[PDB]
Every structure is written in C-alpha cells, then in structure tokens.
Design an enzyme around this catalytic site. Structure first.
Site, short mmCIF file in Angstrom:
data_model
loop_
_atom_site.label_atom_id
_atom_site.label_comp_id
_atom_site.label_asym_id
_atom_site.label_seq_id
_atom_site.Cartn_x
_atom_site.Cartn_y
_atom_site.Cartn_z
N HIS A 1 0.83 -1.19 0.00
CA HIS A 1 0.00 0.00 0.00
C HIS A 1 0.87 1.26 0.00
CE1 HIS A 1 0.23 -0.25 4.57
NE2 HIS A 1 0.12 1.06 4.49
N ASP B 1 -0.38 -7.60 1.34
CA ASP B 1 0.15 -6.23 1.40
C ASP B 1 1.68 -6.22 1.41
OD1 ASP B 1 0.00 -3.45 1.40
OD2 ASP B 1 -0.37 -3.31 3.56
N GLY C 1 3.28 6.20 8.64
CA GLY C 1 4.55 6.29 7.94
C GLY C 1 5.57 5.30 8.48
N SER D 1 4.77 1.90 8.55
CA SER D 1 4.50 0.62 7.91
C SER D 1 5.72 0.22 7.12
CB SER D 1 3.25 0.66 7.00
OG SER D 1 3.50 1.37 5.79
C1 LIG Z 1 -1.34 4.39 10.85
C2 LIG Z 1 -0.45 3.18 10.77
C3 LIG Z 1 -0.52 2.27 9.65
C4 LIG Z 1 0.50 1.36 9.57
C5 LIG Z 1 0.07 2.03 8.47
N1 LIG Z 1 -0.80 1.09 7.63
C6 LIG Z 1 -2.02 1.41 7.14
O1 LIG Z 1 -2.49 2.56 7.27
C7 LIG Z 1 -2.82 0.35 6.57
C8 LIG Z 1 -3.18 0.56 5.12
C9 LIG Z 1 -4.43 -0.35 4.92
O2 LIG Z 1 -4.23 -1.76 5.15
C10 LIG Z 1 -4.02 -2.48 4.04
N2 LIG Z 1 -3.86 -1.89 2.85
C11 LIG Z 1 -3.67 -2.65 1.73
C12 LIG Z 1 -3.60 -4.02 1.83
O3 LIG Z 1 -3.36 -4.85 0.76
C13 LIG Z 1 -2.87 -4.23 -0.42
C14 LIG Z 1 -3.79 -4.64 3.07
C15 LIG Z 1 -3.73 -6.03 3.17
C16 LIG Z 1 -3.88 -6.61 4.42
C17 LIG Z 1 -4.07 -5.83 5.54
CL1 LIG Z 1 -4.25 -6.59 7.06
C18 LIG Z 1 -4.14 -4.44 5.45
C19 LIG Z 1 -3.98 -3.86 4.19
C20 LIG Z 1 -5.21 0.21 6.05
N3 LIG Z 1 -4.20 0.32 7.15
C21 LIG Z 1 -4.48 0.43 8.45
O4 LIG Z 1 -3.60 0.50 9.28
C22 LIG Z 1 -5.95 0.43 8.89
N4 LIG Z 1 -6.05 -0.60 9.92
C23 LIG Z 1 -6.58 -1.81 9.67
O5 LIG Z 1 -7.03 -2.06 8.54
O6 LIG Z 1 -6.60 -2.71 10.65
C24 LIG Z 1 -7.03 -4.05 10.41
C25 LIG Z 1 -6.14 -4.76 9.38
C26 LIG Z 1 -6.89 -4.80 11.73
C27 LIG Z 1 -8.49 -4.07 9.98
C28 LIG Z 1 -6.38 1.81 9.43
C29 LIG Z 1 -6.29 2.80 8.30
C30 LIG Z 1 -7.84 1.74 9.92
C31 LIG Z 1 -5.48 2.29 10.60
C32 LIG Z 1 0.87 3.04 7.79
O7 LIG Z 1 1.64 3.75 8.45
N5 LIG Z 1 0.70 3.22 6.48
S1 LIG Z 1 1.64 4.42 5.84
O8 LIG Z 1 1.32 5.78 6.42
O9 LIG Z 1 3.11 4.11 6.02
C33 LIG Z 1 1.28 4.41 3.94
C34 LIG Z 1 2.18 3.52 3.20
C35 LIG Z 1 2.28 4.98 3.07
#
Ligand SMILES: C=C[C@@H]1C[C@]1(NC(=O)[C@@H]1C[C@@H](Oc2ncc(OC)c3ccc(Cl)cc23)CN1C(=O)[C@@H](NC(=O)OC(C)(C)C)C(C)(C)C)C(=O)NS(=O)(=O)C1CC1
Ligand SMILES: [Zn+2]
Length: 192
Positions: free
Chosen positions: A70, A94, A150, A152
């Site tokens: 993602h 992911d 940020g 992840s």
């Molecule tokens: C704020 C901290 C989080 C860690 C972080 N990751 C996220 O935001 C992730 C993104 C999305 O999840 C997924 N997307 C695509 C997938 O496949 C392509 C997935 C395949 C399997 C699974 Cl598991 C999830 C998937 C939603 N999500 C959540 O965390 C969501 N949480 C969530 O979905 O929790 C459960 C999985 C338990 C439902 C939510 C938005 C609600 C917080 C991050 O920092 N990102 S980032 O800023 O670096 C960005 C890359 C630039």
C-alpha cells in the site's frame, strides 16, 4: 509513468542504539524517482523510503528488502545500478520485496518464540508490543494513529533483535491504535 520508490533515509538497529538519519531531501528526489538511479550506497537494516508525497519504511530480512504494497505499489526502487524491479509482490498480504541492496545488512528471522516484541518506528523509536496472535500484538501504551503513520514496512523485533515481522496495519478504534497487525516473518519466508 509511476516513478521509482526512493530511499530518503535509514534506521540503524546495529549496536546499542537505534537512530534515524536523513539522507536525501525532497529536492534530489524527483530526479531519482524518474531515472530510478540513485548514487547512494545503502546502509542499515531499515530504509526510510518515499513516493511522491508519502514516506514509509522498508526492512531487509534474509537478503530481501521488504515493504508494504500500500506504500510501494508495483513500483521499482531506485538504486545505484538503476531501477530495480520487485522480486516479490503479493497484494493480499500487502507485501512487496526487492533483492536486498548493496550493502544493507539484513535482519535474521526470529526463531525465539518470544512474546515480547518491539516495533521500530520511522523516528527510530522502539516501542514494546506484546504478541497476541500470529499477526497481531498489543501496544503497552495506546498511540494516536498519527504517531504510527509512515512506519508501515518497519520491523517488529524480538528481544535479541531478530525480525518477527513487518508492520502492516494499526488495529484501531476512533483514531487510536491499541495494537499492531504485521506480516509474520514465516509468511515472508513462505512467499520466498
Ligand atoms: C497508521 C499506521 C498504519 C501502519 C500504516 N498502515 C495502514 O495505514 C494500513 C493501510 C491499509 O491496510 C491495508 N492496505 C492494503 C492491503 O493490501 C494491499 C492490506 C492487506 C492486508 C491488511 Cl491486514 C491491510 C492492508 C489500512 N491500514 C491500516 O492501518 C488500517 N487498519 C486496519 O485495517 O486494521 C485491520 C487490518 C486490523 C483491519 C487503518 C487505516 C484503519 C489504521 C501506515 O503507516 N501506512 S503508511 O502511512 O506508512 C502508507 C504507506 C504509506
Ligand atoms: Zn528472536
């Protein structure tokens, strides 16, 4: 087209002290994204990586630099030899992987079975997580989402500093994470 993912910094986990170092600002970035060619040698186990407007992390385990789909999309990563195509891609998990850059140090998959984990954030904070399931762990102190955003692609480590997994998603309620969800290192090894 889409550009390449660009390394813009790194997190050291070697030695006694985790720390972050910025290596590239927004300026140099554009050209690196377009060409996929990055003069910079890679150091460390965890890279701070960037697309046009977003940053996240990438962790080297078993000679593969892993990150989240993602964040990376299907993108190549910029390297000193030009754009590197993804070695692994799995949208359902992911997960994306590239051959580990020269000369990253790679983390060892954990076979400790410890329930005491540590999540490494993009600021190089090391926060305790209690393992709960195969792919979840509870935060000892809840965190606002903004704090974990940020990070992840970063590692969950055992007490000995082995990789237990890759941070994927925050388990949250009303913008507060009580737990983290990750790709366990066994799933990575399976993807290989
Ligand atoms: C704020 C901290 C989080 C860690 C972080 N990751 C996220 O935001 C992730 C993104 C999305 O999840 C997924 N997307 C695509 C997938 O496949 C392509 C997935 C395949 C399997 C699974 Cl598991 C999830 C998937 C939603 N999500 C959540 O965390 C969501 N949480 C969530 O979905 O929790 C459960 C999985 C338990 C439902 C939510 C938005 C609600 C917080 C991050 O920092 N990102 S980032 O800023 O670096 C960005 C890359 C630039
Ligand atoms: Zn271990």
């Amino acid at each position: 087209k889409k550009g390449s993912v660009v390394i813009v910094g790194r997190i050291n986990l070697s030695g006694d002290t985790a720390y972050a170092q910025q290596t590239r600002g927004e300026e140099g970035c554009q050209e690196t994204s377009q060409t996929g060619r990055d003069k910079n040698q890679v150091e460390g186990e965890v890279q701070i990586v960037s697309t046009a407007t977003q940053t996240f992390l990438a962790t080297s385990i078993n000679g593969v630099l892993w990150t989240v789909y993602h964040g990376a999309g299907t993108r190549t990563i910029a390297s000193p030899k030009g754009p590197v195509t993804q070695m692994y891609t799995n949208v359902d998990k992911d997960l994306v992987g590239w051959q580990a850059p020269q000369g990253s140090r790679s983390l060892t998959p954990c076979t400790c079975g410890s329930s005491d984990l540590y999540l490494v954030t993009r600021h190089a904070d090391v926060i305790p997580v209690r393992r709960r399931g195969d792919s979840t762990g509870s935060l000892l102190s809840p965190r606002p989402l903004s704090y974990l955003k940020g990070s992840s692609g970063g590692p969950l480590l055992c007490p000995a500093g082995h990789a237990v997994g890759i941070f994927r998603a925050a388990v949250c309620t009303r913008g507060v994470a009580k737990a983290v969800q990750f790709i366990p290192v066994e799933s990575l090894e399976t993807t290989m």
